[PDB]
Subunit: 258 residues, 2 copies
């Protein structure tokens, strides 16, 4: 009876990417055989990637002692330690990234707010850059276009019942908000002092600190992190967010001699 | 009779169902379809089903009714479905792998802790930051686990988003951090690294790979500048949010110093 196709690594593990439908009775028996031939071989650490359409398989896997590792929509990652060596299966090291947009009209010291008023926030997609992501959210929410300047602050949060947050400052290229930009979304330009003094004022130390940081950048006294564009070991893009002045110094220093 | 699943109601027109007892999958289907209908009428927007590992016989049933995976811990699967006509509000679980590097400076002779295990012979101590784990705690953990050295987090010098090995839409997240060492004695560790030593910053910088490609050249340059005590990064100031009370904001180190000064000098209100 046939084994499962497994792809190996130099951590002694194996990841089975389940791609085509299969009867559950067949899967458990084909898995039980595979578990036997993996304990004889390099034994420890087996991963089953189970896509949403193959949800008819998760019980079969779990019944065989697999547990959950992490999930995206359209795939579930399951894992098992099949060695008698101490279970050292690494926990998930992926995080959900969100971004907060501070869009400053530097001319009027005013900021773009949304539905009581808040900064436009969203999440950074898989494969998306923070600087790209934060701008898209502004455009999706208010219709206005704005370029990314700096990252003012970031934070983490949990107990997570339902994450990483980057506060970014954006520079607007347009000022007209469109009606109606989104369903149950509403927007206006607000003076910075009104935003800081808003009904939360002293609600908690965290919102108050983030607001004060927003204000210091509105007064042009806050040095955040700016981007230095670069490339990885492959041809692929990369961006270093570092001290704004050093970011300039590094970016400027890229020019041509006599 | 509507077989209605017990759920808890949030304030954003959502219901969370936590399944705790075994249920026949057919019965669950019937009960879930009924529930989804009542909720739709009741005005509910986001429906969350939390299925423990041992109740995995229900997973397919939930999925069949339009539920998709949201989050999984070893012991449970959290599933979501949006049942309202309005635009879907739930955050997608779009994740990035998160890493940290430790620049551990010996302030006496401008040396840093290095290990042999990116394509440098001697890299900084680096690892992944677990989901749920503070960067400032995780980077220090990696130091201890690899070298035995107890080191304190001072600043985030830089963070990096890369796109990955032609595979797909994926992007990395990596935090370079600077840490102050308590001891200078490297103990042999039950760890994947082959060896660690102290290495003069200049020799680390002048390594072929750090000289060869631009990205590591910039990271290495940042590290060298912080050794010259001329780099300002993002330091930490701790806060409390309302519902969970343990939180950290990484912000400009001079502002972090100012906010900490003002808060400490505000405790004097006695």
């Amino acid at each position: 009876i046939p084994l499962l196709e497994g792809e190996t690594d130099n951590y002694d593990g194996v990841t089975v990417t389940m791609v085509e439908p299969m009867d559950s009775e067949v899967f458990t028996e084909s898995l039980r055989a595979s578990l036997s031939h993996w304990r004889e071989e390099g034994k420890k650490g087996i991963w089953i990637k189970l896509p949403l359409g193959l949800a008819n398989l998760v019980e079969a896997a779990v019944s065989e002692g697999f547990r959950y590792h992490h999930a995206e929509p359209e795939y579930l990652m399951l894992v098992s330690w099949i060695s008698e060596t101490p279970d050292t299966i690494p926990a998930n090291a992926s995080h959900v990234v969100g971004a907060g947009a501070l869009v400053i009209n530097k001319n009027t010291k005013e900021v773009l707010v949304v539905q009581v008023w808040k900064l436009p926030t969203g999440v950074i997609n898989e494969g998306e850059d923070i600087w790209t992501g934060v701008a898209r959210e502004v455009e999706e929410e208010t219709g206005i276009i704005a370029d990314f300047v700096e990252v003012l602050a970031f934070r983490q949060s949990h107990k997570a019942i339902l994450d990483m947050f980057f506060l970014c400052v954006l520079s607007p290229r347009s000022y007209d908000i469109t009606e109606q930009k989104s369903e149950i979304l509403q927007a206006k330009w607000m003076p910075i002092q009104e935003y800081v003094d808003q009904p939360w004022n002293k609600k908690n130390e965290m919102f108050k600190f983030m607001a004060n940081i927003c204000q210091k950048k509105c007064e042009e006294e806050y040095l955040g992190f700016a981007i230095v564009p670069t490339t990885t070991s492959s041809g692929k893009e990369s961006f270093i967010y570092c001290n704004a002045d050093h970011a300039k110094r590094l970016k400027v220093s890229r020019d041509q001699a006599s």
